[PDB]
Design an enzyme around this catalytic site. Structure first.
Site, mmCIF file in Angstrom:
data_model
loop_
_atom_site.group_PDB
_atom_site.id
_atom_site.type_symbol
_atom_site.label_atom_id
_atom_site.label_comp_id
_atom_site.label_asym_id
_atom_site.label_seq_id
_atom_site.Cartn_x
_atom_site.Cartn_y
_atom_site.Cartn_z
ATOM 1 N N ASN A 123 -10.039 0.619 -0.492
ATOM 2 C CA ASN A 123 -8.923 0.897 0.542
ATOM 3 C C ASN A 123 -9.690 1.139 1.954
ATOM 4 O O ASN A 123 -10.337 2.098 2.169
ATOM 5 C CB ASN A 123 -8.053 1.700 0.179
ATOM 6 C CG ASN A 123 -7.233 1.163 -0.823
ATOM 7 O OD1 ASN A 123 -7.311 0.434 -1.774
ATOM 8 N ND2 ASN A 123 -5.945 1.891 -1.055
ATOM 9 N N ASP A 154 0.694 -1.250 -0.044
ATOM 10 C CA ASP A 154 0.034 -0.079 0.158
ATOM 11 C C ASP A 154 0.739 1.244 -0.141
ATOM 12 O O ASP A 154 1.748 1.506 0.664
ATOM 13 C CB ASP A 154 -0.983 0.126 1.197
ATOM 14 C CG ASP A 154 -1.907 1.079 1.093
ATOM 15 O OD1 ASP A 154 -2.024 1.409 -0.021
ATOM 16 O OD2 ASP A 154 -2.562 1.546 2.221
ATOM 17 N N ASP A 196 -9.099 1.245 6.020
ATOM 18 C CA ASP A 196 -7.800 1.284 7.214
ATOM 19 C C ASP A 196 -8.435 1.920 8.576
ATOM 20 O O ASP A 196 -8.691 1.290 9.612
ATOM 21 C CB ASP A 196 -6.624 1.716 6.769
ATOM 22 C CG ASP A 196 -5.752 1.725 7.808
ATOM 23 O OD1 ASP A 196 -5.794 0.877 8.678
ATOM 24 O OD2 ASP A 196 -4.703 2.481 7.669
ATOM 25 N N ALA A 219 -11.406 5.313 1.397
ATOM 26 C CA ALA A 219 -12.939 5.064 1.490
ATOM 27 C C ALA A 219 -13.475 4.273 2.584
ATOM 28 O O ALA A 219 -14.482 4.081 2.753
ATOM 29 C CB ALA A 219 -12.870 3.688 0.363
ATOM 30 N N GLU A 252 -1.287 5.782 -9.187
ATOM 31 C CA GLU A 252 -2.402 6.814 -8.604
ATOM 32 C C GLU A 252 -2.245 7.979 -9.734
ATOM 33 O O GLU A 252 -1.029 8.134 -10.290
ATOM 34 C CB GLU A 252 -2.200 7.060 -7.114
ATOM 35 C CG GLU A 252 -3.338 8.136 -6.529
ATOM 36 C CD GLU A 252 -3.262 8.117 -5.163
ATOM 37 O OE1 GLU A 252 -2.428 7.639 -4.421
ATOM 38 O OE2 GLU A 252 -4.183 8.592 -4.634
HETATM 39 NA NA NA Z 1 -3.153 0.796 -2.265
HETATM 40 ZN ZN LIG Z 2 -4.180 6.471 -0.540
HETATM 41 ZN ZN LIG Z 3 -3.933 7.640 -2.287
#
Ligand code: NA
Ligand SMILES: [Zn+2]
Ligand SMILES: [Zn+2]
Ligand code: NA
Ligand SMILES: [Zn+2]
Lengths: 290, 291
Positions: free
Chosen positions: A236, A82, A238, A195, A134
């Site tokens: 994603n 990540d 967390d 998210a 990204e």
């Molecule tokens: Na990621």
């Molecule tokens: Zn991120």
């Molecule tokens: Zn990002």
């Protein structure tokens, strides 16, 4: 078992659902994530940030995941780097056994983002590893160009999210018509960063245990679903996990000042984390997709 | 590397020092213990109770330890089943990769204790694994001589006045050191001290400053731990000290920042406090600089 990130996300791309990508930093988070996947019959994206890898050691991060795969050999699992920050970081993860790496150069300009992403892709694809990048808000036409030139497997388009518990200071809204445009031109799995939703029950638990969430708030459940409809396939997650976990740790500390049995702290913390994961798998549509 | 428990304790037995046996239930505990051994150049006994194994899964308990051994291959490490209650439990541990197992039948009569211990020994030794048992009611030194000879057990835990947990002595700290010496001379094997947490003053202060409650807690004094090693103790079971030092830092972080929910901010200081407890104990018992 442990599979290429693209194997899981290609499915979700074709069938139009979202797979949660859940961060872990230790055994308790990892166990609860896997238990949720087993109980919802959902594929798993397991994510480790660079900070989590430094905390655990990359040998342990991969080692624990491999053990868990042997424990639940029927669940498709991708192990994902990540927010990798450098080529060398992504390369170390490839050699260690990650099956998916993300290279974040969105802060750069298009040309340097594309040059570095393309470098990561070549090395990773040479080892059979999928790559996320990204970009961003996103502009759909350069996204089209970025994907075709870089040959990245999935893309994270900027559409109004950001990491942490503090996403929007005003109304929550995401540019879904931008997303549909990105999806059309690229026709690849797309990734939503930042998210976490901070569910109502998770907010209650943290503040009930004396926690301070400030004026934090995340993507509503309705906008995660609309994102999946727009073509998001990897979500994603967390912050939601950490808040649900630590809420229970704080609770135990408050209710019994004489308690120092670690399992009494972390068994309820695992359960709260596991339920956040299970609900998210259903919300995103990955339950019963094994 | 991962070695038979006896390989570590026979060295300790011959040279007259103690090896801390440190319990763990997760990665944070295990990491701090291994870092302490690396920093003090000390062999390591890593213990997991049946409850800890249920919590982790035996595949993760062993798997995490093997990863840590590869990370510090110069450190002798034994992986020890703490308070096995059944032959089947000890046998599962052997099959999973444990290098030492304890069978606790001390609550049975001598004859039933000996029989179960001997059954575990035969299975364990056939697999290359060392065995601990427990006797004691304080230990009967003459029972111990016969017990060890008939069972062929590798090390023995004789009861000499300790007990698990943070509340070991209501009154004066008392350990029957005369009994310990008799057991040692009659058995001439490594001996194990259970309930050996000391609850240091800094650990207690840390727990209480973080808002904790230790009502009349009391461990084995450092001096009693040293006297016990001088008397033949070579394995020193330590658990409670680790947990108090760890949770003290968790409580502190929770108190001082109500907006904190990054797990690493809780557990990094907790690891350090646990590690420091272990380093000091390794020096106290004399296993430091023995690699
Ligand atoms: Na990621
Ligand atoms: Zn991120
Ligand atoms: Zn990002
Ligand atoms: Na033991
Ligand atoms: Zn005991």
């Amino acid at each position: 078992m442990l599979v290429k990130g693209n194997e899981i996300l290609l499915k979700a791309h074709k069938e139009g659902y979202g797979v949660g990508a859940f961060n872990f930093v230790n055994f308790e988070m990892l166990n609860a994530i896997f238990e949720a996947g087993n109980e919802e019959n959902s594929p798993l994206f397991i994510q480790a940030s660079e900070g989590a890898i430094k905390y655990m050691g990359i040998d342990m991060a991969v080692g624990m995941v491999k053990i868990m795969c042997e424990r639940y050999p029927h669940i498709p699992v991708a192990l994902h780097l990540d927010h990798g920050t450098t080529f060398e970081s992504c390369e170390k993860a490839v050699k260690a056994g990650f099956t998916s790496v993300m290279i974040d150069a969105s802060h750069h300009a298009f040309e340097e983002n594309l040059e570095l992403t393309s470098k990561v892709v070549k090395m990773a694809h040479n080892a059979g590893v999928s790559v996320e990048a990204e970009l961003g808000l996103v502009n759909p036409k350069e996204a089209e160009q970025f994907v075709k030139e870089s040959q990245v497997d999935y893309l994270a388009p900027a559409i109004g999210t950001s990491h942490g518990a503090f996403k929007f200071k005003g109304e929550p809204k995401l540019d879904f018509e931008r997303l549909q445009e990105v999806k059309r031109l690229t026709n690849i799995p797309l990734v939503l960063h930042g998210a976490s939703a901070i569910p109502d029950n998770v907010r209650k638990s943290y503040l009930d245990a004396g926690g301070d969430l400030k004026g934090s708030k995340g993507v509503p459940f309705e906008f995660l679903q609309e994102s999946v409809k727009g073509g998001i396939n990897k979500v994603n997650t967390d912050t939601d996990l950490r808040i649900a976990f630590i809420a229970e740790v704080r609770k135990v500390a408050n209710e019994d000042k004489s308690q120092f049995d670690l399992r009494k702290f972390f068994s309820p913390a695992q359960l709260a984390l596991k339920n956040v994961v299970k609900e998210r798998m259903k919300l995103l549509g990955s339950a019963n997709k094994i």
